[PDB]
Amino acid sequence: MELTPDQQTLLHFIMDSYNKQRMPQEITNKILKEAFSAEENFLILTEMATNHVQVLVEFTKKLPGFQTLDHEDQIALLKGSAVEAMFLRSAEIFNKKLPSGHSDLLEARIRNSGISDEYITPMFSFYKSIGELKMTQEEYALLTAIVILSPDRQYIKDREAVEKLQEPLLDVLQKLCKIHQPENPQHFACLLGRLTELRTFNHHHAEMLMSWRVNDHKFTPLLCEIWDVQ
């Protein structure tokens, strides 16, 4: 079925919040312009990830009912979703259509960033899989909201209340999949499958930053709170 006016209103509100993030062109112009050392790229990563969380908290707070949740549940949701959201967002940026060759140069750049090789393969494998899905901005925004509002987060004291919140976003996303990709009824399930793929990156996040080819791994205090580091 088609979106109801209320889902259309919800979707638009969600996009407004979502568009408040740093333009992908900005980020890819920085990477593509000049090549940097592993220490320089580590700095860019920490800054990018610092700004990503600040924006994410703003997006999260604007989600319907989020503020009605138990204070401690809200914290466990943010901690539980920050890394996955950053990876889903990195995947969105990676898949933005660039002029010929830039795609290849961005990948090669990132590949040299300083991250250990153990993580490059599962990272690009995910990005190129997400890319294959051909998601609209709306799908990235809703899937992001779905990720944040996961009842299954460790430490959630009332899963039921989080489920009530994620429920209308799941419905909207499903309708978009049937609207935008009706030549693939599996589309919605593939999106949900990729979420399971995202949680595995979250499991090794601290190791992938700790193993970055640099001497000292300095993180902003905000990053020390979100990332289980230092």
Binding site: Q54, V57, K61, I75, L78, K79, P221, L222, E225, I226
Partner: peptide, 12 residues
């Protein structure tokens, strides 16, 4: 206890 996270959550 994550002051900055709690500060970002509560503020506004």
């Amino acid at each position: 206890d994550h002051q900055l996270l709690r500060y970002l959550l509560d503020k506004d």
